[PDB]
Design an enzyme around this catalytic site. Structure first.
Site, PDB file in Angstrom:
ATOM      1  N   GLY A  68      -2.202   4.808  -3.658  1.00 38.81           N
ATOM      2  CA  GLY A  68      -2.904   3.561  -4.030  1.00 38.81           C
ATOM      3  C   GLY A  68      -2.284   2.078  -3.838  1.00 38.81           C
ATOM      4  O   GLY A  68      -1.108   2.143  -3.348  1.00 38.81           O
ATOM      5  N   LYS A  93       0.715  -0.489  -9.760  1.00 42.28           N
ATOM      6  CA  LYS A  93       0.001   0.511  -8.694  1.00 42.28           C
ATOM      7  C   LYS A  93      -1.233   1.089  -9.404  1.00 42.28           C
ATOM      8  O   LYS A  93      -1.160   1.578 -10.403  1.00 42.28           O
ATOM      9  CB  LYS A  93       0.960   1.887  -8.292  1.00 42.28           C
ATOM     10  CG  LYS A  93       0.308   2.869  -7.345  1.00 42.28           C
ATOM     11  CD  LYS A  93       1.243   3.944  -7.079  1.00 42.28           C
ATOM     12  CE  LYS A  93       1.961   3.512  -5.675  1.00 42.28           C
ATOM     13  NZ  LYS A  93       2.758   4.325  -5.055  1.00 42.28           N
ATOM     14  N   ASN A 133      10.067   3.661   0.245  1.00 42.62           N
ATOM     15  CA  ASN A 133      10.120   4.011  -1.327  1.00 42.62           C
ATOM     16  C   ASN A 133      11.216   3.882  -1.914  1.00 42.62           C
ATOM     17  O   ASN A 133      11.781   4.516  -3.077  1.00 42.62           O
ATOM     18  CB  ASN A 133       9.200   5.288  -1.737  1.00 42.62           C
ATOM     19  CG  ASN A 133       9.696   6.420  -1.078  1.00 42.62           C
ATOM     20  OD1 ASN A 133       9.144   7.251  -0.948  1.00 42.62           O
ATOM     21  ND2 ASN A 133      11.177   6.426  -0.736  1.00 42.62           N
ATOM     22  N   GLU A 154       8.794  -1.436 -13.066  1.00 37.76           N
ATOM     23  CA  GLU A 154       9.475  -2.663 -13.166  1.00 37.76           C
ATOM     24  C   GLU A 154       9.612  -3.196 -11.857  1.00 37.76           C
ATOM     25  O   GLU A 154       9.180  -2.391 -10.620  1.00 37.76           O
ATOM     26  CB  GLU A 154      11.076  -2.207 -13.391  1.00 37.76           C
ATOM     27  CG  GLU A 154      11.782  -1.455 -12.164  1.00 37.76           C
ATOM     28  CD  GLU A 154      13.223  -1.186 -12.329  1.00 37.76           C
ATOM     29  OE1 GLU A 154      13.742  -2.370 -12.351  1.00 37.76           O
ATOM     30  OE2 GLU A 154      13.753  -0.151 -12.539  1.00 37.76           O
ATOM     31  N   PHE A 155       9.806  -4.455 -11.726  1.00 38.41           N
ATOM     32  CA  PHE A 155       9.536  -5.158 -10.285  1.00 38.41           C
ATOM     33  C   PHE A 155      10.687  -5.227  -9.664  1.00 38.41           C
ATOM     34  O   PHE A 155      11.709  -5.785 -10.217  1.00 38.41           O
ATOM     35  CB  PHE A 155       8.982  -6.620 -10.566  1.00 38.41           C
ATOM     36  CG  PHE A 155       8.639  -7.303  -9.270  1.00 38.41           C
ATOM     37  CD1 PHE A 155       7.627  -7.014  -8.436  1.00 38.41           C
ATOM     38  CD2 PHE A 155       9.529  -8.561  -8.813  1.00 38.41           C
ATOM     39  CE1 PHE A 155       7.429  -7.628  -7.401  1.00 38.41           C
ATOM     40  CE2 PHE A 155       9.200  -9.112  -7.634  1.00 38.41           C
ATOM     41  CZ  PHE A 155       8.261  -8.952  -6.824  1.00 38.41           C
ATOM     42  N   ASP A 198       9.356  13.386  -0.768  1.00 40.57           N
ATOM     43  CA  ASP A 198       8.725  12.662   0.116  1.00 40.57           C
ATOM     44  C   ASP A 198       9.516  11.191   0.372  1.00 40.57           C
ATOM     45  O   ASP A 198       8.910  10.309   0.367  1.00 40.57           O
ATOM     46  CB  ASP A 198       7.285  12.138   0.085  1.00 40.57           C
ATOM     47  CG  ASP A 198       6.741  11.450   1.284  1.00 40.57           C
ATOM     48  OD1 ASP A 198       7.300  11.808   2.404  1.00 40.57           O
ATOM     49  OD2 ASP A 198       5.630  10.865   1.245  1.00 40.57           O
ATOM     50  N   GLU A 241       0.769  -1.148  -0.050  1.00 41.45           N
ATOM     51  CA  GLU A 241       0.202   0.074   0.082  1.00 41.45           C
ATOM     52  C   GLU A 241       1.039   1.237   0.145  1.00 41.45           C
ATOM     53  O   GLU A 241       1.609   1.523   0.881  1.00 41.45           O
ATOM     54  CB  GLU A 241      -0.820  -0.072   1.138  1.00 41.45           C
ATOM     55  CG  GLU A 241      -1.592  -1.382   1.555  1.00 41.45           C
ATOM     56  CD  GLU A 241      -2.416  -1.616   2.770  1.00 41.45           C
ATOM     57  OE1 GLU A 241      -2.130  -0.769   3.616  1.00 41.45           O
ATOM     58  OE2 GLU A 241      -3.602  -1.928   2.776  1.00 41.45           O
ATOM     59  N   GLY A 242       0.676   2.070  -1.014  1.00 39.24           N
ATOM     60  CA  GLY A 242       1.523   3.199  -1.250  1.00 39.24           C
ATOM     61  C   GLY A 242       0.759   4.380  -0.636  1.00 39.24           C
ATOM     62  O   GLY A 242      -0.083   4.266   0.111  1.00 39.24           O
ATOM     63  N   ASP A 250       8.438   6.349  -6.694  1.00 36.17           N
ATOM     64  CA  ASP A 250       7.542   7.499  -6.708  1.00 36.17           C
ATOM     65  C   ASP A 250       8.171   8.865  -6.749  1.00 36.17           C
ATOM     66  O   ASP A 250       7.572   9.759  -6.465  1.00 36.17           O
ATOM     67  CB  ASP A 250       6.923   7.293  -5.185  1.00 36.17           C
ATOM     68  CG  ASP A 250       5.966   6.373  -4.982  1.00 36.17           C
ATOM     69  OD1 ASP A 250       5.499   5.701  -5.972  1.00 36.17           O
ATOM     70  OD2 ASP A 250       5.446   5.985  -3.852  1.00 36.17           O
TER      71      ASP A 250
HETATM   72  C1  HDY Z   1       6.497   1.759  -6.543  1.00 35.28           C
HETATM   73  C2  HDY Z   1       6.052   1.138  -5.481  1.00 35.28           C
HETATM   74  N1  HDY Z   1       5.333   1.653  -4.676  1.00 35.28           N
HETATM   75  C3  HDY Z   1       4.913   0.586  -3.515  1.00 35.28           C
HETATM   76  C4  HDY Z   1       4.070   0.765  -2.328  1.00 35.28           C
HETATM   77  C5  HDY Z   1       4.043  -0.283  -1.554  1.00 35.28           C
HETATM   78  C6  HDY Z   1       4.802  -1.577  -1.822  1.00 35.28           C
HETATM   79  C7  HDY Z   1       5.550  -1.744  -3.309  1.00 35.28           C
HETATM   80  N2  HDY Z   1       5.553  -0.451  -3.823  1.00 35.28           N
HETATM   81  C8  HDY Z   1       6.292  -0.546  -5.099  1.00 35.28           C
HETATM   82  C9  HDY Z   1       7.303  -1.273  -5.809  1.00 35.28           C
HETATM   83  C10 HDY Z   1       7.538  -1.018  -7.048  1.00 35.28           C
HETATM   84  C11 HDY Z   1       8.184  -2.063  -7.688  1.00 35.28           C
HETATM   85  N3  HDY Z   1       8.820  -3.160  -7.026  1.00 35.28           N
HETATM   86  C12 HDY Z   1       8.272  -3.218  -5.654  1.00 35.28           C
HETATM   87  N4  HDY Z   1       8.683  -4.367  -4.833  1.00 35.28           N
HETATM   88  C13 HDY Z   1       8.185  -4.849  -3.634  1.00 35.28           C
HETATM   89  C14 HDY Z   1       8.411  -6.317  -3.467  1.00 35.28           C
HETATM   90  C15 HDY Z   1       7.913  -6.692  -2.354  1.00 35.28           C
HETATM   91  C16 HDY Z   1       7.703  -5.984  -1.141  1.00 35.28           C
HETATM   92  O1  HDY Z   1       7.210  -6.583  -0.160  1.00 35.28           O
HETATM   93  C17 HDY Z   1       6.014  -6.985   0.450  1.00 35.28           C
HETATM   94  C18 HDY Z   1       6.486  -8.247   1.634  1.00 35.28           C
HETATM   95  O2  HDY Z   1       7.615  -8.154   1.771  1.00 35.28           O
HETATM   96  C19 HDY Z   1       5.693  -7.681   3.026  1.00 35.28           C
HETATM   97  N5  HDY Z   1       4.371  -8.138   3.098  1.00 35.28           N
HETATM   98  C20 HDY Z   1       3.940  -9.315   3.930  1.00 35.28           C
HETATM   99  C21 HDY Z   1       3.690  -6.917   3.755  1.00 35.28           C
HETATM  100  C22 HDY Z   1       7.896  -4.392  -1.394  1.00 35.28           C
HETATM  101  C23 HDY Z   1       8.111  -3.964  -2.369  1.00 35.28           C
HETATM  102  N6  HDY Z   1       7.382  -2.353  -5.177  1.00 35.28           N
END
Ligand code: HDY
Length: 287
Positions: free
Chosen positions: A16, A33, A123, A72-73, A118, A12-13, A136
């Site tokens: 969104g 997102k 992030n 990208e992931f 921010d 959760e960002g 972000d």
């Molecule tokens: C751009 C972006 N914003 C957010 C906000 C919340 C979570 C992720 N994001 C991303 C984003 C973009 C690209 N890749 C990723 N990867 C990522 C993958 C796994 C993640 O963790 C979740 C679990 O480790 C914990 N879960 C049990 C709560 C966090 C980020 N996040």
């Protein structure tokens, strides 16, 4: 959206929900997102803001009262790594690598006159090779930084620059350097530098550590919109106390990242040239 197979909710960002997804046609694995909705124009411009230390913004899809951002992931966020590293600490060489890469990402965005505004551990995203990337970038300017997120979570103040808290309307790229300095300190000590729980608590925490700012250190400070002459006057502490393990090159860079006057705060480009990074390397993290 008919084009994406949702794999799992990754979090959760501010604006969104974020899903891991697979593009049903190309089989590309992405972070998706979904924001429940000039902002479109500005966000759309970020597709060209490409750098190795910025999370790639693959696509922007605006349909049906929703704005989808295709990223990208990455493997995980830095907050989770910091949490898992609480008992032992992130090794210094890795901290230095991450700061070096993060500064590269800032210098790039700031060179294009784009600020984050921010930054926070959540992030900052890392992979298993040793890279770290800023996510972000540019979304604050497009939407504003709200008090609460889309899920009604408090937006953290811990990384907020003093000029923002004092009510300045026109912030500079220096606000990102402040935030990044606070994150640096947090990685080193394994505690937040300034964990404020309101705007005034955040301000007074800064003041108790760095000294209450005055016209000597920060010209114009007493004329800022939310400055009050009645602020308690606290003496500045020696950095030796603030981030102790840290060597002198480290403390020198951090102190320069935490200068009160935005105009004197070190630039990301100047920071990259700092002697702290003389021996920088790229270690592989133990996740
Ligand atoms: C751009 C972006 N914003 C957010 C906000 C919340 C979570 C992720 N994001 C991303 C984003 C973009 C690209 N890749 C990723 N990867 C990522 C993958 C796994 C993640 O963790 C979740 C679990 O480790 C914990 N879960 C049990 C709560 C966090 C980020 N996040």
């Amino acid at each position: 959206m008919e084009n994406f197979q949702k794999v799992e909710k990754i979090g959760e960002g501010t604006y969104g929900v974020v899903y891991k997804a697979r593009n049903k046609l190309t089989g590309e694995v992405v972070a998706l997102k979904k924001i429940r909705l000039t902002a479109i124009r500005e966000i759309s411009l970020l597709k060209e803001l490409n750098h190795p230390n910025i999370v790639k913004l693959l696509d922007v899809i605006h349909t049906e009262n929703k704005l989808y951002l295709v990223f990208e992931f990455l493997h995980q966020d830095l907050k989770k790594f910091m949490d898992a590293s609480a008992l032992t600490g992130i090794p210094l060489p890795l901290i230095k690598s991450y700061l070096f890469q993060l500064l590269q990402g800032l210098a790039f965005c700031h060179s294009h006159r784009v600020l984050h505004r921010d930054l926070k551990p959540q992030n900052l995203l890392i992979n298993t090779e040793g890279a770290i990337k800023l996510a972000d970038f540019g979304l604050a300017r497009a939407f504003g930084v709200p008090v609460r997120t889309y899920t009604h979570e408090v937006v953290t103040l811990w990384y907020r620059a003093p000029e923002i808290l004092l009510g300045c309307k026109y912030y500079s790229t220096a606000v990102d350097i402040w935030s990044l300095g606070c994150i640096f300190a947090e990685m080193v000590t394994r505690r937040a530098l300034f964990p404020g729980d309101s705007e005034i608590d955040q301000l007074f925490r800064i003041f108790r550590t760095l000294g209450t700012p005055d016209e000597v250190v920060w010209p114009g400070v007493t004329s800022m919109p939310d400055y009050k002459p009645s602020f308690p006057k606290w003496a500045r502490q020696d950095f030796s106390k603030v981030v102790p393990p840290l060597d002198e090159d480290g403390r020198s860079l951090l102190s320069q990242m935490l200068h009160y006057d935005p105009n004197k705060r070190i630039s990301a480009k100047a920071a990259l040239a700092h002697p702290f990074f003389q021996d920088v390397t790229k270690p592989v993290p133990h996740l």
